[PDB]
């Protein structure tokens, strides 16, 4: 580990600087270093980890989609042969993306999830596991596609089960988990009805619990509820 010689607190400090500078690859490397110190992460630190990798993989996914669209067009009737370059470069980006996913999944397996006992941490990490398997599924085309999809499903489902038992329906982690699992259903699992049912039930159960919340908690929850509504509007 290139970050092995840097203090944990310094890695966290620098991750926050990297975020301010929109240097998300650096941010992710600092946070990977912090995880590899072996101590559990605080709430703030978990969110630094997720922001960093979300931004890195988000850029890769966007690039992959551009290149995949170009590649698809190249394989239409009437398209002139341009050689192996589009496929090669799409493959390059794909391999980089898979590498980032494998890095995140590796951190979760060694050893964030096994040490996470509180619902807020455990659900957070299992949601991340589902998310990064979902990103692997987006680019999968081979013999392991079904197993990758099932890995995402299994992680999300464990997170859902804990969240329903241990968290209020307005909890932002619970809401975000449901949002993303709903998208998994729609986009990955070919289950649009399940996606819609989950988003609607999640929204409605949160609505009914808003009365319990402070002004600041209400703002946090209603933000994510609006994302559920946005997806429902897209899908209906």
């Amino acid at each position: 580990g290139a970050m092995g010689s840097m203090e944990r607190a310094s890695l966290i400090q620098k991750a926050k600087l990297a975020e301010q500078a929109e240097r998300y690859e650096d941010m992710a490397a600092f946070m990977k270093g912090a995880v590899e110190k072996g101590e559990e992460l605080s709430c703030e630190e978990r969110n630094l980890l997720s922001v960093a990798y979300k931004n890195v993989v988000g850029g890769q996914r966007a690039a992959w989609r551009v290149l995949s669209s170009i590649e698809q067009k190249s394989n239409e009737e009437g398209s002139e042969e341009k050689g192996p370059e589009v496929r090669e470069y799409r493959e390059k980006v794909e391999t980089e993306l898979q590498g980032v996913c494998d890095t995140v999944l590796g951190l979760l397996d060694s050893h964030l999830i096994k040490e996470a006992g509180d619902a807020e941490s455990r659900v957070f990490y299992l949601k991340m596991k589902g998310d990064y398997y979902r990103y692997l599924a987006e680019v999968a085309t081979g013999d392991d596609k079904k197993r990758i999809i099932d890995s995402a499903r299994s992680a999300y489902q464990e997170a859902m089960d804990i969240s329903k038992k241990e968290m209020p329906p307005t909890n932002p982690i619970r809401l975000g988990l449901a949002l993303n699992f709903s998208v998994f259903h729609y986009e990955i699992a070919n289950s649009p009805e399940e996606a819609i049912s989950l988003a609607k039930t999640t929204f409605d159960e949160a609505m009914a619990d808003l009365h319990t919340l402070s002004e600041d908690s209400y703002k946090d929850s209603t933000l994510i509820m609006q994302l559920l509504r946005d997806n429902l509007t897209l899908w209906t």
């Binding site: 949002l179 998208v183 729609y186 994510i224 994302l227």
Partner: peptide, 5 residues
């Protein structure tokens, strides 16, 4: 693309 967090 749908919203995720």
């Amino acid at each position: 693309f749908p919203a995720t967090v």
